[PDB]
Each structure stands twice: as structure tokens, then as C-alpha cells.
């Protein structure tokens, strides 16, 4: 069910950078001069990004949400994906401009959008576990509060490997197949980052072994600010609990966020 396009159908422009497993470029459809994005594999059995390639394609193909990144077609020599280029960037970089803070109305917009996207992912039979949810993977479409969509979820090769474990739910570390509650834990981290603008767990320096243990065994988490809404705090705290069971359904998270 997914179109194939030929090289004569798209025009390359400039290279955006690496997303997920590949290299993203900015391009346009020749028929329409509409902008598009092309994802390709970049060159010892690590070239197992190929599965990530296929995995991303399969998953993107069957999904359709405003808050989820879309796929348009495929290209073949070399194998490539033509997908949407989100215009405004990624969340990680945006949070790096401290001089210019994101507006609360907007931060709220971003949080909801992500939840709506993730809520949708988990309503699938079977559910979709992203597994690589962190700020670099949240793409921004508009930073305007009145826009239909502000944030979109991305990077669907479902692998794990700012990316090391600050973002990972505890059962997940040093494990392979990662329920959907892992994502809930990650989402909490994302909520924490949008709110604070500071990366998760950056207030601590522990060696790797100690750090895992602190998170797994002791319960260490980031410190939420005193001036954080109780409604929001409560939500974050739940999603990031040690017991995966205590983590909420996205129905709850979304509703609560809406009241904020
Ligand atoms: C207008 O297009 C975008 C621009 C930017 C952007 O401004 N960046 C990102 C990387 C960039 N680097 C280049 C040089 N710099 C000195 C170091 C880092 C810095 C600033 C970021 C994202 C953009 N849009 C975009 N749309 C769809 C994506 C995707 N991104 N990427 C890169 C992905 C990123 C993560 C996960 C998935 C994707 C992806 O699949 N797509 C299709």
C-alpha cells in the first residue's frame, strides 16, 4: 500500500541532518514544488539500521495522526524514504535557546500534542512502543499557540540503544523487549524537559553503574520546580514511577493536561 517514486520525481535541496537511523535531506516534489524530506541509510553488521529502515516504514505506513510524522513514498536505488519535513526543528535544540523562552501557552500546547500522539500510538492493537522518545525525536511544526499542530512524534525504527539512559524507564535498562509503559516514563521526562528547559537528570553526576542503580533501586528522579502546577506535577510523578503498573493511561494524561 505504499507508493514508489522515481529519482526523477524529487529534487534535493540541502541536507538537514540525521534522524533516527538515517540522514535527512530537504527536497521538493517536482510536480508540486512542495517540500519533502528524504531519508537514506548512511553506510559491519551495524548496518542493521536497514531493519530500522524497514521497521520505520512499516509503522509509519499504517499510522495517520496529526501529531505523528508521515510517510509519502519510497525510492529504490538507493533505498530511500520521502516523508514530511517538519519546518521548525526539533525540541532538543529549541530548548537550547535560553534567551528566548517558550511561552506557557505554547509549552502546554507541546505537551498536549505529544500526549495526543502517544495516546494514539497506544490505542493500536497491538500498541506501538516507540522506545526512543526523548527531545531530539519530537519535531516542531509551529511554535504558535493557535496552530492546529505544534508538535509531531518521530523516529519509528523501534530501537533504543541527548540519548543515553536519562530517558529510559527502569525495567528497560539492560533489557530487550519494553512494554508501552516505558513510553509513559519517557513522556514524563519529556514533560519535565519542556517545563524546565533543562535536560533530565542533569542535576546529578554519578558513574554509569551508580546511576542506573540510583534510578532502578533508589528512585532518583529529577526535581520538579516549586512553581509547577500541582496538576502537572502530579501527572509527571505518576508517569515516572518505578512500578510500570502505576503509570497512567493516556486518556488520563491528556484530560489532565487539558485542564491546565
Ligand atoms: C526544517 O527542517 C528541520 C531543521 C532542523 C534543524 O534546524 N536542526 C536539526 C539538526 C541540525 N544540525 C546540522 C548542523 N549543525 C551545526 C549541527 C546539527 C541543527 C538544527 C531540525 C529538524 C527539521 N525538520 C525535520 N523534519 C523531518 C525529519 C527531521 N527533521 N529529522 C532531522 C528527524 C530528526 C529526528 C528524528 C526523525 C527525523 C525525521 O525522520 N524527519 C523526517
Can you say how many angstroms the Cα of residue 33 is from the centroid of all Cα atoms in its chain? 28
Residue 110 shares a structural domain with residue 121: yes
* Strands 35-41 and 10-19, bridge-based pairing: unpaired
- SS3 assignment, position 256: helix
Decide which of 37, 67, 87 is a domain's last residue.
87
Decide which of 87, 113, 135 is a domain's last residue.
87
Eight-state DSSP code of residue 218: I
The conformational region for residue 118 under phi > 0 = left, psi -120 to 50 = alpha, else beta, is alpha
* Annotated resolution, angstroms: 3.0
CA gap 50, 54 in Å, rounded: 6
Residue whose C-alpha cell is 535498562: 173
Residue 24 shares a structural domain with residue 78: yes
Q: What CATH number is associated with residue 152?
A: 1.10.510.10
- SS3 assignment, position 147: coil
Q: Which helix (H) or strand (E) holds 27?
A: strand 22-29
Residues near 45 by Cβ (< 8 Å), separated by ≥ 6? none
Q: By residue range, what is the domain housing residue 64?
A: 1-87
Residue 114 shares a structural domain with residue 202: yes
The technique is: X-ray
Cα–Cα nearest to 107, from 166, 152, 150? 150
Helix, strand, coil distribution of the chain in percent, nearest 5: 40, 15, 45
Pocket test for ligand 1, best of 10, 16, 73 (most atoms within 8 A of CB): 16
Residue 197 shares a structural domain with residue 73: no
Q: What CATH number is associated with residue 48?
A: 3.30.200.20
83 ligand 1 Cβ < 6 A: yes
Decide which of 20, 53, 87 is a domain's last residue.
87
89 ligand 1 Cβ < 6 A: yes
Q: How many helices (H) and strands (E) does the chain have?
A: 7, 7
Q: Is the dihedral of CA 16, 86, 80, 125 positive or negative?
A: positive
CA gap 140, 190 in Å, rounded: 14
Is position 18 annotated in a ligand binding site?
yes
Residue 72 shares a structural domain with residue 124: no
Question: Packing angle between helix 181-196 and helix 230-239, nearest 10 degrees?
Answer: 140
Kindly give the distance from the C-alpha atom of residue 240 to the centroid of ligand 1, in angstroms, as a whole number: 28
In the chain, the number of structural domains is 2
Pocket test for ligand 1, best of 10, 15, 19 (most atoms within 8 A of CB): 19
Q: Which residues pair with 227 in a beta bridge?
A: none
The three three-digit cell numbers of residue 209, written as one number: 553503574
The conformational region for residue 21 under phi > 0 = left, psi -120 to 50 = alpha, else beta, is alpha
CA gap 157, 154 in Å, rounded: 9
How many angstroms separate the most distant Cα atoms in the chain? 57
Cα–Cα nearest to 70, from 3, 144, 124? 3
Question: Packing angle between helix 181-196 and helix 104-121, nearest 10 degrees?
Answer: 170
Can you say how many angstroms the Cα of residue 170 is from the centroid of all Cα atoms in its chain? 18
139 ligand 1 Cβ < 6 A: yes
Is position 207 annotated in a ligand binding site?
no
Is position 236 annotated in a ligand binding site?
no
Residue 232 shares a structural domain with residue 221: yes
Residue 60 shares a structural domain with residue 100: no
85 ligand 1 Cβ < 6 A: yes
Check if the beta carbon of residue 124 is closer than 8 Å to that of residue 41.
Answer: no
Amino acid at each position: 500500500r505504499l507508493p514508489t517514486l522515481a529519482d526523477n520525481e524529487i529534487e534535493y535541496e540541502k541536507q538537514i541532518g540525521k534522524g533516527g537511523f538515517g540522514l535527512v535531506h530537504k527536497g521538493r516534489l517536482v510536480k508540486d514544488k512542495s517540500v519533502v524530506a528524504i531519508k537514506s541509510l548512511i553506510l559491519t553488521e551495524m548496518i542493521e539500521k536497514f531493519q530500522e529502515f524497514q521497521r520505520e516504514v512499516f509503522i509509519m505506513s499504517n499510522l495517520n495522526h496529526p501529531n505523528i510524522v508521515k510517510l509519502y513514498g519510497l525510492m529504490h536505488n538507493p533505498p530511500r524514504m520521502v516523508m514530511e519535513l517538519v519546518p521548525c526543528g526539533d525540541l532538543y535544540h529549541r530548548l537550547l535557546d535560553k534567551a528566548h523562552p517558550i511561552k506557557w501557552s505554547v509549552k502546554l500546547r507541546l505537551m498536549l500534542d505529544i500526549a495526543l500522539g502517544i495516546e494514539y500510538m497506544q490505542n493500536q492493537n497491538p500498541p506501538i512502543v516507540h522506545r526512543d522518545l526523548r527531545s531530539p525525536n519530537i519535531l516542531l511544526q509551529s511554535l504558535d499557540e493557535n496552530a492546529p499542530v505544534c508538535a509531531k512524534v518521530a523516529d519509528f525504527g523501534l530501537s533504543q540503544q541527548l540519548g543515553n539512559f536519562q530517558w529510559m524507564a527502569p525495567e528497560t535498562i539492560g533489557a530487550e523487549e519494553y512494554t508501552e509503559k516505558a513510553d509513559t516514563y519517557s513522556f514524563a521526562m519529556i514533560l519535565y524537559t519542556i517545563l524546565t528547559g533543562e535536560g533530565p537528570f542533569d542535576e546529578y553526576s554519578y558513574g554509569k553503574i551508580k546511576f542506573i542503580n540510583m534510578i532502578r533501586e533508589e528512585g532518583l528522579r529529577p526535581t520538579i520546580p516549586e512553581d509547577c502546577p500541582p496538576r502537572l506535577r502530579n501527572v509527571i510523578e505518576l508517569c515516572w514511577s518505578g512500578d510500570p503498573k502505576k503509570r497512567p493511561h493516556f486518556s488520563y494524561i491528556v484530560k489532565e493536561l487539558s485542564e491546565l
